[PDB]
RNA sequence: AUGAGGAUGACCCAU
RNA sequence: AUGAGGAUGACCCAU
RNA sequence: UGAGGAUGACCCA
RNA sequence: UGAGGAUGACCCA
């Protein structure tokens, strides 16, 4: 089941959706980027490895561009001022079955669901209170 | 207001749903745990820090346990066979507006949506190909 | 949600009630103080820590002041003639479920219920006999 | 007259109530134990001493056991899987009158009354937040 | 009386008012920010501590954005050129009663009232003369 | 003009109003005191300095006294039981226009307005919760 | 320069 | 600060 | 650990 | 004294 296909990263109900597509596969690290310059693109990378004898580990990185007052195709410096970096590390014991793993995916989905604490804090430039 | 509220971490259609509640805010680290013995509980922690002069960093951690009943010293104890750990760090520039942050939240949601590449690989115990 | 709120420490019918309110939550130590002169105020502090691999430990402290006025050089100040110090430590293994914890709390409330041995000895400047 | 009597430590309606009864009063230390196996019993001890010239100090201790059966070599014994330990010290100046003492007792009962911050945190395996 | 609620920081008679709302409570330090990027937001933080045996101390910090020629949602450097920092430290002796403290609040209100020397000097980019 | 004028520091409706007047400008520090013995007077000081190449810093200090009559050496002297100290530093960039500065003054006024969070906490001898 | 550093208060301390 | 560094998990390691 | 003291988030064996 | 540990009337600084 080849899963290295393009998908919708940011969904705005069909209109203004951000699609990210396969762009690199060097070293088993899969990469997806949006149709932009690499300085203003949405980037996603993913890889898996046996971190130790007892665990496997997925490393997922996401890069999101600052859009407000952005100049499409322009040179915007400093780079650090225009990009956000998401860095995810998922450690799963080798005993985890397919079912166990489905549960783990759901926990991640639940964590970021709309209206829940964490995503609400992030979207409002806040912390917890 | 107050975003420090309980929420559903694992959704199984209102039955066997893993719901998590606020349990501690000591040292600026917001904590949530499920109704279980501290040894078998799901745990979620969050904290925001001004990592740099121009950055803010969210550090989020989730612990998914595999519940079991061990028999140490010929006695039964509620324990965890093993634990899966999710570790994410999100660095956001201070110049990001609320709408810029909403864009990051949506990207994270789209990333883990059912059927998309990454959650599919994780749930099937495989890599991206 | 939040339990770091104001509450009635001493209940005297509805009036003369001593209420203690949040004042500080620095370094994992929550603190409650009663209104007016800090010098004549009631104080309550609380904290929890993983005392060891299997134990979590609560450290609770209460201070009951003896309100008085100090005159010196014809200058009077609101002070506490003296203070009574309550100091308790509660150790709970990580295997304790919410039910086990509820039982522990009932034990503490029973220990101090009116008419029982200990609260009666204390209330009468006495010991056991 | 005597306050070294039996009393209800844990109140569960009228049945399932945990009663603790006198067992020993050696060396100024009063001790109460619940019926049946000493190994699975609840324990409460109390003592008072002149800690200094101006202070008298009460030292109270409670033990809540986790009842369980231990099997070894096919030989089972009634034991406590683990124990929760309550430990409190109350210091009271010799100037405190019976009224002052009654106030101190109300403070302790208020601190642990249902719904209040501390008994709620404990009952839920939580801290303050 | 939960006082950690939103309030109007800059009042322009209903039209164009700047409201600041709860955004963080890490370490007992309360934080309020306006609905902006954190680089252009109005920020307010407050905390209290026992500075010494004789005093308590409120530390209040306010950050005000430079608005003239501002680009909403834009990246404006250097940060020091676009922000003003207010740093307040209020030391109150433990003997101060609620009344004493009300007087202290009034002194602060009087200090900054319209038409008075200090606020007039500040609003006109002047000193005293 | 000349903004160095007397003003009402504490307003109690034209009766018992603490009014403060110009008393010294030595060393670039504007001083105001109330009509009292220098030992029992309210004191307000202000000074502006070009703290940096691109900053100006206002340093404001207010002293609220608790008046009393001490009897040193068997003689009566007008003195202060204790003093409360307000210490504020305001750093404003040189690029701030007059309208930018008016915005800072309004923020400080809104901050201390009756009924708002901070002045409420201070007047009640509590923290923010 | 920075400190939710301290003060008796136009001073002191740490970096 | 950086690591498709590790973990028993608000900790540890390398640079 | 302490039926160790305390001017109580400190101190002693 | 200790928001020091405990197999809780013991033990550590």
Structural domains of chain F in order of their starting residue, each with its CATH number:
1-129 (3.30.380.10)
The answer to whether C49 and C94 are in contact (CB under 8 A) is no
Read off the tokens for D1.
Answer: 């007259």
**Angle of CA points A102, A104, A109, to nearest 5°:** 95
The minimum CA-CA distance between C19 and chain D, rounded to whole Å, is 10
- Contacts with E22 from chain B: Cβ below 8 Å: 1-2
CB proximity list for A74: less than 8 A, separation 6 or greater: none
Phi, psi torsion values for E118, nearest 5 degrees: -55, -60
CB proximity list for F29: less than 8 A, separation 6 or greater: F45, F46, F47
What was the elucidation method?
A: X-ray
Query: Helical H runs in chain E?
Result: 98-111, 117-123
For residue B90, the surrounding DSSP H or E stretch is strand B77-93
Beta-strand (E) ranges in chain D?
7-10, 18-26, 29-34, 43-50, 55-72, 75-93
**Angle of CA points E89, E91, E97, to nearest 5°:** 135
Assign D124 to helix, strand or coil.
coil
Read off the tokens for F28.
Answer: 């670039």
Exposed e or buried b for every residue in D12-27, given b needs 16+ CB within 10 A?
eeeeeebebebbebee
What is the pairing mode between strands E43-49 and E30-33? Answer: antiparallel
Phi, psi torsion values for F73, nearest 5 degrees: 50, 40
| SS3 sequence of chain A | CCCCCCEEEECCCCCCCEEEEEEECHHHCEEEECCCCCCCCCEEEEEEECCCCCEEEEEEEEEEECCCCCCCCCCCCCHHHCEEEEEEEEEEECCCCHHHHHHHHHHHHHHCCCCCHHHHHHHCCCCCC
Phi, psi torsion values for D63, nearest 5 degrees: -130, 120
Closest C-alpha to F129, from E26, E2, E44: E2
CA C22 to chain centre: 13
CA closest to E1 among chain C residues = C6
Phi, psi torsion values for D87, nearest 5 degrees: -140, 110
Phi, psi torsion values for B82, nearest 5 degrees: -165, 170
In the sheet that holds C43-50, the strands lie side by side as C7-10, C18-26, C29-34, C43-50, C55-72, C75-93, D75-93, D55-72, D43-50, D29-34, D18-26, D7-10
Distance CA A58, CA D116 (A): 44
Whether omega for the bond prior to residue A70 falls within 30 degrees of 0, making it cis, is no
CA closest to C95 among chain B residues = B37
CA closest to E46 among chain C residues = C24
Q: Say which nucleotide is closest to residue C48, CA to C1' distance.
A: J3
Read off the tokens for C94.
Answer: 């990580």
The minimum CA-CA distance between B110 and chain D, rounded to whole Å, is 31
CB proximity list for D108: less than 8 A, separation 6 or greater: C62, C86, C112, C119, D90
| Residue A56 CA distance to nucleotide H7 C1' (Å) | 13
Query: Helical H runs in D1-129?
Result: 98-111, 117-123
Distance CA D4, CA A97 (A): 59
Torsion from C-alpha of E110, E112, E113, E115, nearest 10 degrees: 120
Closest C-alpha to C120, from D22, D109, D56: D109
Q: Could you tell me which residues are beta bridge partners of residue B92?
A: B56
> What are the DSSP calls for chain F, one per residue?
--S---EEEE-STTSS-EEEEEEE-GGG-EEEEESS-TTT--EEEEEEE--SSSEEEEEEEEEEEEEEEE-GGG--EEEEEEEEEEEEEEEEETT--HHHHHHHHHHHHHHT-TTSHHHHHHHTT----
- Cβ-in-10-Å burial (0-12, 13-18, 19+) of C84 comes to buried
Distance CA E5, CA E20 (A): 9
Read off the tokens for A122.
Answer: 């992030």
Choose from C12, C16, C18, C117 for mutation: most chain D CBs within 10 A.
C117
Within window 50-109 on C, which residues have Cβ closer than 7 Å to strand J? 51-52, 54-55, 57, 59-61, 87, 89, 91
Place of tokens 């307040």: E88
Structural resolution in Å:
2.8
The answer to whether A42 and A10 are in contact (CB under 8 A) is yes
Separation of first and last alpha carbons in chain C? 46
The answer to whether A61 and A88 are in contact (CB under 8 A) is yes
Distance CA F119, CA F122 (A): 5
Out of D66, D91, D122, name the one closest to residue C90 (CB): D122
- Cβ-in-10-Å burial (0-12, 13-18, 19+) of B113 comes to middle
Q: Is strand G less than 7 A from the beta carbon of F24?
A: no
- Contacts with A43 from chain B: Cβ below 8 Å: none
Read off the tokens for D21.
Answer: 């009864």
Is C26 in contact with E49 (Cβ distance < 8 A)? yes
The answer to whether F57 and F48 are in contact (CB under 8 A) is yes
Assign E57 to helix, strand or coil.
strand
Read off the tokens for A75.
Answer: 């040179």
> What are the DSSP calls for B42-86, one per residue?
-EEEEEEE--SSSEEEEEEEEEEEEEEEE-GGG--EEEEEEEEEE
Exposed e or buried b for every residue in C8-28, given b needs 16+ CB within 10 A?
bbbeeeeeeebbbbbbbbbeb
The answer to whether C83 and C34 are in contact (CB under 8 A) is no
Phi, psi torsion values for A120, nearest 5 degrees: -70, -40
- Contacts with B19 from chain A: Cβ below 8 Å: none
Within window 19-78 on E, which residues have Cβ closer than 7 Å to strand G? 29, 45-47, 49, 51-52, 54-55, 57, 59-61
The answer to whether C9 and C27 are in contact (CB under 8 A) is no
The answer to whether A82 and B97 are in contact (CB under 8 A) is no
Read off the tokens for D56.
Answer: 């008298």
Distance CA A13, CA B125 (A): 31
Place of tokens 């899969």: A30
Distance CA D83, CA D40 (A): 9
Closest C-alpha to F20, from F46, F43, F37: F43
- Contacts with E75 from chain B: Cβ below 8 Å: 95
Phi, psi torsion values for D39, nearest 5 degrees: -65, -25
Read off the tokens for B1.
Answer: 């207001």
Out of E1, E48, E95, name the one closest to residue C37 (CB): E95
Maximum distance among all Cα pairs of chain F, rounded to whole angstroms? 59
In the sheet that holds B30-34, the strands lie side by side as A7-10, A18-24, A30-33, A43-49, A55-65, A83-93, B77-93, B55-70, B43-49, B30-34, B18-24, B7-10
Neighbouring chains of B at 3+ CB pairs under 8 Å are: A, C, D, E
The minimum CA-CA distance between C129 and chain B, rounded to whole Å, is 40
Distance CA B34, CA B42 (A): 5
Closest C-alpha to C112, from D12, D4, D113, D32: D113
Distance CA A51, CA C87 (A): 47
Count of Cβ atoms closer than 10 Å to residue F2 Cβ: 8
| Residue B14 CA: distances (Å) to CA of A68, C2, E90, E108 | 39, 25, 51, 54
| Residue B67 CA: distances (Å) to CA of A100, A113, B77, C90, D25 | 11, 25, 11, 26, 45
Q: Could you tell me which residues are beta bridge partners of residue B24?
A: B31
Q: Is strand J less than 7 A from the beta carbon of D47?
A: yes
Q: Could you tell me which residues are beta bridge partners of residue B58?
A: B48, B90
Distance CA F20, CA F12 (A): 14
CA closest to A5 among chain B residues = B117
Closest C-alpha to C74, from F98, B96, F79: F79
Exposed e or buried b for every residue in D67-100, given b needs 16+ CB within 10 A?
ebebeeeeeeeebbbbebbbebebbbbeebeeeb
Distance CA B108, CA B86 (A): 14
| Residue F96 CA: distances (Å) to CA of E36, F43, F99, F100 | 19, 29, 8, 5
Q: Which residue is nearest to nucleotide J9 (CA to C1')?
A: D29
Whether omega for the bond prior to residue A113 falls within 30 degrees of 0, making it cis, is no
Read off the tokens for A11.
Answer: 């969904």
Count of Cβ atoms closer than 10 Å to residue E18 Cβ: 20
- Contacts with B98 from chain E: Cβ below 8 Å: 35-37
The answer to whether E18 and E41 are in contact (CB under 8 A) is no
Exposed e or buried b for every residue in A103-128, given b needs 16+ CB within 10 A?
bbbbbbbbbbbeebbbbbbbbbbbbb
Residues in chain F preceding a C-to-N separation beyond 2.5 angstroms (breaks): none
Place of tokens 């609770």: C60
- Contacts with A110 from chain B: Cβ below 8 Å: 7-11, 18
Is C3 in contact with D93 (Cβ distance < 8 A)? no
């Amino acid at each position: 089941a080849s899963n290295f296909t393009q998908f919708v990263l940011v969904d705005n109900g069909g209109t203004g959706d951000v699609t990210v597509a396969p762009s690199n596969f060097a070293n088993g690290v899969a990469e997806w980027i949006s149709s932009n310059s690499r300085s203003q693109a949405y980037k996603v990378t993913c890889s898996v490895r046996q971190s130790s004898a007892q665990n496997r580990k997925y490393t997922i990185k996401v890069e999101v561009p600052k859009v407000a007052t952005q100049t499409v195709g322009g040179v915007e410096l400093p780079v650090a001022a225009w990009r956000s970096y998401l860095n995810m590390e998922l450690t799963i014991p080798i005993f985890a079955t397919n079912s166990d793993c489905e549960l783990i995916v759901k926990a991640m989905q639940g964590l970021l669901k709309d209206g829940n604490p964490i995503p609400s804090a992030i979207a409002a430039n806040s912390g917890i209170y």
